[PDB]
Design an enzyme around this catalytic site. Structure first.
Site, short mmCIF file in Angstrom:
data_model
loop_
_atom_site.label_atom_id
_atom_site.label_comp_id
_atom_site.label_asym_id
_atom_site.label_seq_id
_atom_site.Cartn_x
_atom_site.Cartn_y
_atom_site.Cartn_z
CG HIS A 26 -2.01 -1.02 1.17
ND1 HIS A 26 -3.25 -0.85 0.59
CD2 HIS A 26 -2.01 -2.28 1.69
CE1 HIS A 26 -3.96 -1.94 0.74
NE2 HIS A 26 -3.24 -2.83 1.41
CE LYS A 44 -6.40 14.30 -0.42
NZ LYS A 44 -6.45 12.99 -1.13
NE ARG A 45 -4.50 10.64 9.84
CZ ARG A 45 -4.38 9.70 10.78
NH1 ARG A 45 -5.29 8.75 10.91
NH2 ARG A 45 -3.33 9.73 11.59
CE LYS A 95 -2.73 10.98 2.51
NZ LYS A 95 -3.50 10.30 1.43
CB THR A 142 -9.97 5.18 -1.68
OG1 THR A 142 -9.58 5.57 -0.36
CG2 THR A 142 -9.29 3.86 -2.06
CE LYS A 177 -13.56 7.04 0.41
NZ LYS A 177 -13.05 7.44 1.77
O1 LIG Z 1 -2.13 3.58 4.45
C1 LIG Z 1 -1.30 3.10 3.67
C2 LIG Z 1 -0.05 2.35 4.16
N1 LIG Z 1 0.10 2.38 5.63
C3 LIG Z 1 1.24 2.67 6.24
C4 LIG Z 1 0.96 2.59 7.53
C5 LIG Z 1 1.83 2.81 8.60
C6 LIG Z 1 1.42 2.53 9.90
C7 LIG Z 1 2.29 2.75 10.97
C8 LIG Z 1 3.57 3.25 10.73
C9 LIG Z 1 3.98 3.53 9.43
C10 LIG Z 1 3.11 3.30 8.36
N2 LIG Z 1 -0.34 2.26 7.60
N3 LIG Z 1 -0.79 2.15 6.46
N4 LIG Z 1 -1.38 3.18 2.35
C11 LIG Z 1 -2.52 3.84 1.68
O2 LIG Z 1 -3.35 2.74 1.21
C12 LIG Z 1 -4.52 3.16 0.48
C13 LIG Z 1 -5.35 1.91 0.15
O3 LIG Z 1 -4.58 1.04 -0.70
C14 LIG Z 1 -4.06 3.92 -0.78
O4 LIG Z 1 -5.19 4.33 -1.56
C15 LIG Z 1 -3.19 5.14 -0.39
O5 LIG Z 1 -2.67 5.75 -1.58
C16 LIG Z 1 -2.03 4.71 0.51
O6 LIG Z 1 -1.34 5.86 1.02
#
Ligand SMILES: O=C(Cn1cc(-c2ccccc2)nn1)N[C@@H]1O[C@H](CO)[C@@H](O)[C@H](O)[C@H]1O
Ligand SMILES: O=C(Cn1cc(-c2ccccc2)nn1)N[C@@H]1O[C@H](CO)[C@@H](O)[C@H](O)[C@H]1O
Lengths: 807, 807
Positions: A349, A540-541, A546, A648, A652
């Site tokens: 991801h 978004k976060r 971003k 995503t 939306k």
């Molecule tokens: O959120 C993430 C990856 N991620 C990284 C982490 C993370 C959690 C803790 C520490 C460091 C990283 N948690 N999730 N990727 C997002 O995934 C979405 C669904 O596939 C995409 O649409 C976004 O582009 C992507 O940023």
């Protein structure tokens, strides 16, 4: 309201039954009568009533899977960003109009009751929400699918804005209970930590462990009007079966499921996080093995089980499965490994290196000694394969190793995932391609057939029918209701690009949604927004990548241009930015403060008035996304090219009648391909241009020196124009932009500002704005999560999806 | 089984309805069908079905109190030893036979289902159980009464016996949920801790406090077949509304309601215990004030509110009420005090000085600074009254002061209670008299009218109808069912002392109960007991004062006498001792080990065989008391005269057809008075004899020197006869008995042994044993808690009890 046909029928006997069961729950469940009953009591009465309608189907669905014995799909995730459940359940069961009428006859406003429900905010952002959309689509496509995660007592923190700064408060989402879940304490399982390995005559034995119990809570997942109800199983930590201190110390084990880690970047090797990850993995795999054995010897395991790893977070499933198969089931290593790889698949991801999980070997040795042993053996055998395939290529061995060799030796969990999975996928075409081209190039060269793309999607139930019934209705009026689970049918709307009635209705729906959102902000925050302004939305976060900061630069540009030429007409805008910052990410917290500080100046300048407003949307979450997205005119998707794996939120907005301003990044590329680039506001560096800048070195000073308007803004920020009481407040932002900007904000400034001018130019022409909107809505079909899941099913899991109804 | 008339009618439509609702709950509540449903599922299905029958009455009862506005009785206790709820609810609603038939028709054994329910073990022993009996009687007597306590996550520990030693395990009574309680998160209230006092223009202000929320859980309390359902409200601690650590630290506040303190003697000034006590007090009094204001200015408060303090544990209610009335309601001190004293009454439950609560002033100053200020002012004014009444009596002032002056300065909570209450009562005639004569003599002389007696009682619902339906039935067969809530009617049974049929039936019922208990021990522990032996039972918390050790001396005496004269016939006995020891009470834990160690020798001596057995009943609790008490032949009530304030186990045995061997202590005296001393096995020193020994000094050596049989036993204990692998194991017991025995075990040895001989002599004559039993059962009527509560109502609370039915 009730006139909306997509919301179903209010059958006379159904309405009568609903009222009766509503009253029954108020009496027997809530132990209230109408004299003392609160709106919350009424919400819960309705929730229990609606939940009762799931039960028969839920029992029958799971019995059906036992009888038919299909291949089971296990979706393992540390996050399920589910949002609220009441409306979704009613939609999927065709009960919405019936409940609306029933509550109306009881003198209640169902929409007021809906607002009482807490979000199940068991996720950070896109990844968690993707899991939730995926659960929905898997049930709608009739898959024998199970979501497995952790039941956090506290989800993502509630965000408060105080003095213009983010404040975090605990998300006590279970305060008043959860009427959807069914606790299953009878199916509690032991999870083991620490201890040591004994290698004996039978083999290896993991002994002297500390036990933490995993108690499952099952939540129904209704498919769209197909009588399928699947299960999300979430594990809750329970202590195993001076005196007082010993009882209090039960809290320590139970802390494992206490709270979701709120950081969605910058991996921090916290032991508690590692415990959470193993907790889900160990308990889940016990369930999987049990169900496999109670179905009809491990040769057939991959024929009956698929394990999907949502990121590397549950990557311990790979060595855990090996551990169970080798140590407990007594399979030879080779067979167990054949089984494991065919069972497991991994979804990546992001490409940002600081997001990658790399656990110190010392931590793994202490907490999970048997797993570390297994990982080392996996690595030895995998690197033997590399060495055989690429003889003498020593650096390739170093690059591909599961073991990273620095001052602190670490296990690369992504490498473990690739080695232990038969499929690896990215989440948009551009992202999956970069995985094969750069990030995992060595792995792609070894096993090219492993590497796949599965472009992300969103559920058109939650993200159209629920959140935007007005748009769902005007669409259904023309093309019927089939599109709701066959979103490619939206292409039929291209036939209406010149249809006067449809053009009128699309614009009417947008205006209605904007009025509703304005009413929300006034009601909840006493914030007034101009309903006759372009709603410019970036939700978004909060992340440097971003580029909320790029949005900030444009907002100030608009302000400065107004002040320079006050007489010149500009399209009125309400610029809305919202999203949570990770608690320990300084820059992200500074960015929020900058947005509010810009607002403090802009929103109070009498020369500006209602021509420009900048607002920070507090506590951005799934339920708020459902409110703001249908009200949006412009969707901000402005990540530096190559940084957003898919996105995503972009999808939306497209589905909900907003036009997109964005870079050629993630799924933006495919969105523009589907609609035609002429229908998207594409700007900025492509990935190739970013790389060219990297090759020669990014010098922000050059842009500062060449762009007078940028220079003005940076000097305003530095001199304290946006913080007169604390002139140096934004020094860190300025310093980063000038000297340490990984994301090249300045490099896209000019193209962004010019592209925004073209947005304003089109908005001045209501008819052509709306026609371009129709061209967007009509081509958003690819971005249904049904399409995504159908691909996972056919291309990875080896199962055929089916929209076929159950009795 | 179902033939028992006291268990009600199995109406055809009632049985049909019950089966339907049972199945409904299995489906909608438990989400199971009959294919996967476990006995636990079936228990819960029945529990929910039965609970539904309480709801209408529960709502109507509480509405009735709102309409009628009676004086409300608030029973404040840190303990509610409720036991199981399923059978009690069925009994009080006349549903037992109907549910029995309904479950039978569904192919289930209701009694097997009943065994699934966890005890609500939210108490240590007699005090906690008294509160529970009191709740039952107050509902049966139609009083507008509310039990208020704390909802401990963990009640009294589950006792395991391992290697002959007590082991403690957490009592996770809420593991599978509690189907009886209704969570009321909407009625959550703030409780304040720490902080400081600001004395300003308006007056004193408690500021800078830490907040802990109190969430109420309401449990229905059904009266006996009068359609009254009162409420037990128990408060649960909730945290107020790095990042991760901060969320985890919510546990600290929530620890307040985590666990019941398992010590029932030797007061330990633990801060967490003090927090628990204030927690209940503060939240409860907010409820009381709220209800008072929503009823119909504080002049009428004592006319509408009674606060009963169960021991000094909720004594903070006195300064808390003053705090609310003075600081918040702005009443003058004098009026507030008039109100407080007329509102509050205090029940004292022991004379043992180490049980008294004396809180260090430093702890009160830190945790509750405003309360300490108020206590000091209460003390000054109270001692002014003493000084005016007894001019120049300086030592009286010192003795009576709420402040104790030693190295650590402390507040005597008993003194606070007396000063702040209009009534003070002991719990048996002898106890209440000693309070006026010695313990609180100074207080009695100042305010003689304050001092009362309220001899304890037990509910004949739980303690006869539920636990011994066979006895309840043979009684009802002769005198009808009125006795069940009019226990004095048992006196009618004196007419049957010569009735051949009744004599036969009483003995038959006892034998049936003994067979059932033998079957319980075989089923659950594979322990075989001789059903043709006298069941000699001492069940109660393990205490030096309760003299389980004296029982031990007699048991060894029986063993030694058998070995000396193996040919001599003796009445076969099964000597059963059970009860929990406080975790940090060394002697109590040693006593348990001695009982098991005696068993290890006796139970394996082939010369003894089935003529004598000594067993330690593991995990003595309310549910076990309901099993063993109806099976008992001999009730051991052998506390040193003057030490047991009342006892209640004594009453349970008397009601259930056991004969009593006991000292003239607590309520034993009144029990023997009611039945006639000729019908009780009374032995040992009276209080006067104990005092005479104290006057000259207790020398255990003298008894050792004069009693050869005692000498033999002490030498067996010292030499390791009962611990051959660890000869010195019982050195501490021997040392205490020989040199440091506060309770004069040796002094009652000879009379006890001789009295036991007379027990055996009577048991050899079945007819005369049973006739004496009839004389006991027939005169147990005074010891109904209905009688006790009727006295509290008329003599303290100023309310008239009523057995009148609700519609
Ligand atoms: O959120 C993430 C990856 N991620 C990284 C982490 C993370 C959690 C803790 C520490 C460091 C990283 N948690 N999730 N990727 C997002 O995934 C979405 C669904 O596939 C995409 O649409 C976004 O582009 C992507 O940023
Ligand atoms: O349990 C108590 C008093 N108590 C003392 C404590 C205690 C708790 C913690 C530390 C020290 C003492 N808890 N309760 N008294 C018993 O009350 C029963 C009901 O009135 C009487 O029947 C018993 O005789 C009496 O021992």
């Amino acid at each position: 309201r009730k006139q909306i046909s997509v919301r179903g029928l209010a059958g006379v006997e159904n309405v009568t039954e609903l009222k009766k069961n509503f009253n029954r729950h108020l009496h027997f469940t809530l132990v209230k009568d109408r004299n003392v009953a609160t709106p919350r009591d009424y919400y819960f009465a309705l929730a229990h009533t609606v939940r009762d309608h799931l039960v028969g189907r839920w029992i029958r669905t799971q019995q059906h899977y036992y009888e038919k014995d299909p291949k089971r799909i296990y979706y393992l995730s540390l996050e399920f960003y589910m949002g609220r459940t009441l409306q979704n359940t009613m939609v999927n069961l065709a009960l919405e109009n019936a409940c609306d009428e029933a509550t109306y006859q009881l003198g209640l406003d169902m929409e007021e009751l809906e607002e009482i429900e807490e979000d199940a905010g068991l996720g950070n952002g896109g990844l968690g929400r993707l899991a939730a959309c995926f659960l929905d689509s898997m049930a709608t496509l009739g898959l024998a699918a199970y979501g497995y995660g952790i039941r956090y007592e506290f989800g993502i923190f509630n965000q408060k804005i105080c003095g213009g700064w983010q404040m975090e408060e605990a998300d006590d989402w279970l305060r008043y209970g959860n009427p959807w879940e069914k606790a299953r304490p009878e199916f509690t399982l032991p999870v083991h930590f620490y201890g040591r390995v004994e290698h004996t005559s039978q083999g290896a034995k993991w002994v002297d462990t500390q036990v933490v119990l995993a108690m499952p809570y099952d939540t129904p997942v209704p498919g769209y009007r197909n009588n399928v109800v699947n299960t999300m199983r979430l594990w809750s930590a329970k202590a195993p079966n001076g005196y007082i201190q010993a009882v209090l110390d039960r809290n320590l084990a139970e802390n494992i499921s206490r709270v979701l880690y709120p950081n969605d970047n910058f991996f921090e090797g916290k032991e508690l996080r590692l415990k959470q990850e193993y907790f889900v993995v160990a308990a889940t795999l016990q369930d999987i093995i049990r169900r496999f054995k109670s179905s009809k010897n491990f040769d057939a395991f991959p024929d009956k089980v698929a394990i999907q790893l949502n990121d590397t977070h549950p990557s311990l499933a790979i060595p855990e499965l090996m551990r169970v198969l080798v140590d407990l089931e007594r399979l030879d290593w080779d067979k167990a490994w054949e089984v494991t790889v065919k069972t497991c698949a991994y979804t990546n991801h992001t490409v940002l290196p600081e997001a990658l999980e790399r656990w110190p070997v010392h931590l793994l040795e202490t907490l999970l000694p048997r797993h570390l042993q297994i990982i080392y053996e996996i690595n030895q055998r995998f690197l033997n394969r590399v060495a055989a395939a690429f003889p003498g290529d020593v650096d390739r061995l170093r690059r591909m190793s599961l073991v990273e060799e620095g001052a602190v030796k670490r296990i690369n969990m992504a490498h473990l995932c690739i080695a232990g999975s038969h499929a690896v996928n990215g989440v948009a075409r551009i992202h999956s391609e970069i995985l094969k081209k750069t990030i995992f190039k060595d792995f792609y060269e070894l096993e090219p057939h492993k590497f796949q793309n599965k472009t992300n999607g969103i559920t058109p139930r939650r993200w159209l029918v629920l959140c935007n019934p007005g748009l769902a209705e005007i669409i259904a009026e023309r093309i019927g209701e089939e599109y709701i689970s066959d979103l490619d049918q939206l292409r039929k709307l291209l036939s209406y690009v010149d249809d006067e009635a449809f053009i009128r209705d699309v614009a009417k729906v947008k205006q209605e949604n904007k009025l509703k959102f304005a009413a929300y902000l006034e009601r909840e925050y006493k914030v007034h927004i101009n309903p006759n302004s372009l709603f410019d939305v970036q939700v978004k976060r909060i992340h440097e990548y971003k580029r909320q900061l790029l949005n900030c630069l444009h907002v100030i540009t608009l302000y400065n241009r107004i002040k320079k030429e006050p007489n010149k007409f500009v399209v009125p805008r309400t610029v809305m930015i919202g999203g949570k910052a990770a608690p320990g990410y300084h820059m992200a917290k500074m960015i929020i403060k900058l947005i509010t500080a810009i607002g403090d100046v802009v929103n109070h300048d009498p020369v500006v008035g209602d021509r420009l407003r900048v607002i920070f949307l507090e506590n951005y979450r799934v339920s708020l996304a459902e409110k703001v997205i249908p009200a949006a005119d412009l969707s901000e998707q402005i990540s530096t090219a190559g940084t957003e794996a898919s996105g995503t939120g972009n999808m939306k907005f497209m589905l909900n009648g907003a036009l997109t301003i964005g870079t050629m990044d993630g799924a933006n590329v495919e969105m523009a391909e589907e609609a035609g680039e002429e229908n998207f506001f594409i700007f900025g560096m492509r990935v190739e241009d970013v790389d060219r800048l990297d090759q020669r070195g990014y010098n922000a000073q050059e842009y500062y020196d060449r762009i007078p308007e940028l220079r003005q803004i940076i000097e305003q920020l530095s001199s304290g124009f946006f913080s007169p009481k604390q002139p140096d407040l934004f020094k860190d932002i300025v310093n980063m932009l000038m000297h340490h900007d990984r994301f090249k904000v300045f490099a896209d400034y000019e193209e962004y500002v010019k592209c925004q001018e073209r947005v304003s130019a089109l908005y001045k022409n209501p008819r052509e704005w709306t026609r371009m909107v129709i061209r967007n809505i009509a081509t958003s079909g690819k971005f249904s999560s049904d399409r995504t899941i159908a691909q996972y099913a056919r291309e990875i899991w080896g199962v055929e999806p089916s929209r076929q109804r159950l009795p």
